[PDB]
């Protein structure tokens, strides 16, 4: 049979694509004259599947959707303390208010607004890095997560640099407050090239899935980012991604996201899927009209909402077998707190206060520090009850 | 053996309880003179387990922590449209700004601030309900989720009604804008009694778990609230619960929560656990000092963070058995989009474009509309490939 999801997506493309409201970004010709009759969607699963429909392979500048990735890179290269001194965590609109820098913090509100993205770019490789190093670091982080060397679209870069007064204003104000060290023109040039990196709806979905898994690339299984960093990026995408309309967006859609003025929308739902949507025309507030619409649909039709709990739980225990004098305990899935707690419940549910317990981890896909420590503790306690515990773990995961 | 979690909690009580910073709510004697040397924690699992430590059974007025429950009740009794006309979804501080009502919305920002809670109380049973009916509706919803008839502490009620000018101010302003219909004194009296409902750290954890499961009581498995309503309540708890400090709180703790001035903190992490914490002394912004501290700890030590994905995923497929001419497909766990998509992948991964497929749902605990529809579609498609599909479902769940 054929997989039904890509067909569901194809339907959305036809339904939502029946109309094309809004306008393309007018501030530059390349974006203004862009062909508006394009619309693609792509969903990437944590296990490596990729479902799409429409123009999911058409390249377009990523723009503001580049902010979470450069932020992740900055956190990795400088540490939380160094980045947090220059970039806050308070959600806010794009409209700039100097009073935000006058606060004892002396830092732009968050990493999703232009002022915050400039401060982030300045932090990219280190205090002594060159303009070139920081820019390639932006491209590298975005390429590593997409799974392919990405390129900058210089035509857009140049068109944008010709009308970059607002960003130069933000960078100059930041320098006066000490948030930037290098020149305003330098940091703005890096941020604008960064926004000119070309990507497809599919790149965004893959990229979003890396974030959704805690930093594990779905296609290779390799760890691209420490999980505490992905956790932070997705948190800020949630509280600030859709600006001051983040409250209504969190309630109505529940999918951490960020949109770009070229029509792209990035989505990352932790543990479930990465989303990528493309559609040039923007609504009254600058987000892709249909891109935003498509997200609300995926959320409603499939219940892909942050507040919709989906967890392993007690299924972490494949089955308990009381053969005779010994108990066989088979585990499975991605064991984190939820599963571990359930496995601990199973052990406690045995009267050992049975002469041998065997822990089978063959069906387990992985386990985090929380799960290892918790299960390791349950073993110590079992043994202390004078019970023999043998952990049959093929691929040493414990 | 003994379960390790309640012991971990006991340690936190001893560690965090080594100090007792802040002050109790000074606005009234009953809260001001309350014994500050009390501290309890309780975690409720989706499966019905309840781990606690310290003073988790000491009663205290729920206060502001009552807002998400009355909001859930209002949504159930009036429908989303009627409630949304009077209560917004924009996060904001407790400080009141009339300009928020002057907006074309003419409604307080959200249901977690006093102005929003008053508008919610007014909606409780219906347009013609009596003061008594609405108040008992507040107590009923809170009791149904706690699992026991809860009582109002009239000593607190009276102490609070003697100094209720601020709330009377908010209610009177709301009436001028048409958000309230009944008298200011009436709605304020209901809201204040509502805040005087007595609860324990354990009631909050249980109550929070009902929200965390989509409205399923963990102790009975019965559905107390439609899932779309729980989804909404937890969404607003996330974006507005911890006021304008919700951005830092979402990033640093990642647990949807709401605190009360009596020292209580309510937590509800979708799909994983309900939290209840109690500790009288408040920090500079009105939240339980140690209560807030305890939450940050549970989040860091156990990774109980909203942005930390934990899902069934491919584990939804217990195992695929190709006997000979027929394939046996066994499913398990809570099948929602994530699992269903994985089951669809399994079906597609069969070359049917094998003469019979058998779907075993014995190990499945439940399945939502999204999972049923998706799996039902995979069956239709399999059959269309000229394949025989027999669904062995004991407890008719499909």
Automatic annotation (TrEMBL), chains A, B:
It comes from the Bacteria. GO terms for biological process: glutamate biosynthetic process; L-glutamine catabolic process. Its EC number is 3.5.1.2. It catalyses: L-glutamine + H2O = L-glutamate + NH4(+). Substrate binds at residues 64, 114, 160, 167, 191, 243, 261. HAMAP family: Glutaminase. Homotetramer. Belongs to the glutaminase family. This is Glutaminase. It comes from Micrococcus luteus (Micrococcus lysodeikticus). The gene is glsA.
């Amino acid at each position: 049979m054929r997989h039904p999801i890509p067909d569901y997506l194809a339907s959305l493309v036809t339904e939502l694509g029946a109309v094309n409201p809004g306008e393309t970004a007018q501030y530059i010709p390349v974006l203004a004259e862009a062909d508006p009759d394009r619309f693609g969607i792509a969903l990437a699963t944590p296990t490596g599947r990729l479902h799409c429909a429409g123009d999911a392979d058409v390249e377009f500048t990523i723009q503001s959707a580049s902010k979470p990735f450069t932020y992740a890179a900055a956190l990795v290269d400088r540490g939380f303390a160094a980045v947090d001194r220059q970039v806050g965590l308070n959600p806010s609109g794009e409209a700039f208010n100097e009073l935000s820098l006058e606060a004892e913090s002396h830092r732009p509100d968050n990493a999703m607004i232009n002022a915050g993205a400039l401060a982030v770019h300045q932090l990219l490789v280190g205090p002594e890095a060159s303009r070139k190093e920081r820019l390639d670091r932006a491209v590298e982080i975005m390429s590593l997560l997409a799974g392919r060397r990405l390129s900058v679209d210089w035509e857009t870069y140049e068109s944008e640099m010709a009308v970059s007064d607002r960003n130069l204003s933000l960078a100059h104000m930041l320098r006066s407050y000490g948030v930037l060290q290098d020149s305003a023109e330098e940091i703005v040039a890096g941020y604008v090239a960064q926004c000119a990196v070309l990507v497809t709806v599919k790149d965004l979905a893959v990229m979003g899935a890396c974030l959704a898994t805690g930093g594990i690339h779905p296609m290779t299984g390799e760890r691209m980012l420490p999980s505490i960093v992905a956790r932070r990026v997705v948190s800020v995408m949630t509280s600030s991604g859709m600006y001051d309309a983040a409250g209504q967006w969190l309630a109505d859609v529940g999918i951490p996201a960020k949109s770009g003025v070229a029509g792209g929308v990035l989505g990352a739902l932790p543990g479930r899927v990465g989303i990528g949507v493309f559609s040039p025309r923007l609504d009254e507030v600058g987000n892709s009209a249909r891109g935003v619409l498509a997200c609300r649909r995926l959320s409603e039709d499939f219940r892909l909402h942050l507040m919709d709990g989906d967890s392993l739980g007690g299924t972490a225990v494949r089955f308990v077998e009381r053969e005779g004098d010994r108990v066989f305990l088979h585990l499975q899935g991605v064991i984190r707190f939820g599963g571990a707690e359930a496995v601990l419940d199973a052990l406690t549910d045995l009267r050992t206060g049975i002469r041998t317990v065997v822990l089978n981890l063959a069906r387990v896909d992985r386990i985090d520090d929380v799960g290892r420590r918790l299960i390791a503790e349950g073993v110590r306690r079992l043994q202390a009850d004078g019970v023999r515990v043998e952990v049959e773990d093929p691929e040493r995961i414990l």
